Design a protein around this ligand. Sequence first.
Ligand SMILES: Oc1c(Br)c(Br)c(Br)c(Br)c1Br
Ligand SMILES: Oc1c(Br)c(Br)c(Br)c(Br)c1Br
Lengths: 116, 116, 116, 116
Amino acid sequence: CPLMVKVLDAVRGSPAINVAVHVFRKAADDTWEPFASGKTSESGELHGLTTEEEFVEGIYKVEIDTKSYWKALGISPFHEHAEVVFTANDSGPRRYTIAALLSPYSYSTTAVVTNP
Amino acid sequence: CPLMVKVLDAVRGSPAINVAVHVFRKAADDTWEPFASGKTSESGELHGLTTEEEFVEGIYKVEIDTKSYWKALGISPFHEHAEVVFTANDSGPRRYTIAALLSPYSYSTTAVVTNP
Amino acid sequence: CPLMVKVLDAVRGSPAINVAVHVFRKAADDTWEPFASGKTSESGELHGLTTEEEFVEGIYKVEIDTKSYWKALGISPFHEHAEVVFTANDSGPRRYTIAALLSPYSYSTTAVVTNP
Amino acid sequence: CPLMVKVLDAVRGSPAINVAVHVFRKAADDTWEPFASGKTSESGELHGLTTEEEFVEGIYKVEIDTKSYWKALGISPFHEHAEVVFTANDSGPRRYTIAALLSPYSYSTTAVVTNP
Ligand SMILES: Oc1c(Br)c(Br)c(Br)c(Br)c1Br
Ligand SMILES: Oc1c(Br)c(Br)c(Br)c(Br)c1Br
């Protein structure tokens, strides 16, 4: 899988488990079309969202439902979610790991991109 | 002004100057409607985006044009922009400072909410 | 004052108030000698640590007592403290702002160096 | 191995390869004694620093040589290194992953702690 998402909880110092993640791709008509979704595992990771064949060149958006994650832990966070928007595979296929480091009032997101 | 944005450049170690910032408010149609905008100053700050009278409760999105910023510096960026989506609530501190720390392939955004 | 520290709390989304900060300067014996110290204000800032006359080139260490801060809030922390070690250089901007963004199991520190 | 270090480059969006890492443990006499060292792999990871038997309860310091990393890339960074100081195994053996996200003038470090 060319697209992987990893979510970590900066309060507990652990993977953020069962976090919903939705991926969209900008369509020719400039609207966000559903592309893939899933939930993070016990390791805070989400694999198998797509394939090299399906993951074509385009602008993508990964929305991580951080609000539900914090609310489930008894915390009312600042952000509705964490959304990562980026152009992918414009110079050929690449492997993308989208990491998100979560705190109730702050989050960091990083992309580690490597060749297939 | 109850809403301010501050942006920093983690590569140069300085305020991120002249970064375009657009604020949107979610409408009944669930669409994003332009609310306020501007460019960060020499101190990397943007104030005077709104007033207490106009800044009512609701869902807001702050989009920071990080791609144009890195492009101007000749550094290849990953993200199209940095979006901060949140719900403004009156039963909470009155002033919101959205700080964004930028790196070409990584960014963090934090909300510092305080009283006047 | 050419050196200032600002600390934020990523859990509460506010300035980190009353955090102990100690500055050390590396001596010829390669040991750390106390240089300046204080506690962050209600705005999470610490200024007036030194003067331009005293702040000569050399290696400095800023230690932020993050453990005592989280302990006071009843949240189990990971780090003993946050250390920022750097070389001050005259052939570079004159003012240093060391910002630290705190989470119980994660922290980021950034240097914003500017001219007067 | 109960102690792993992962280093990422936030400018290139890739693992930070060949980064020197030194680990120390506070001795009964309150000085930092050498404990283990190594360099990050092509994946930005450093495994095999210690064992469950050797990694006893104590205060540890992981110093990541970020300066040499940036200098080798033609960049003069702010920090001399990134040092993570923490108490380990005080409630029994744990597995620690110390992650460091690097930028020339900023760095973030997070600890993901899990049971053996
Ligand atoms: O003033 C700030 C600076 Br400078 C940095 Br860097 C960060 Br991160 C945050 Br949050 C604030 Br508020
Ligand atoms: O594996 C990672 C972990 Br763990 C953390 Br924390 C961060 Br930040 C990043 Br980027 C990666 Br990739």
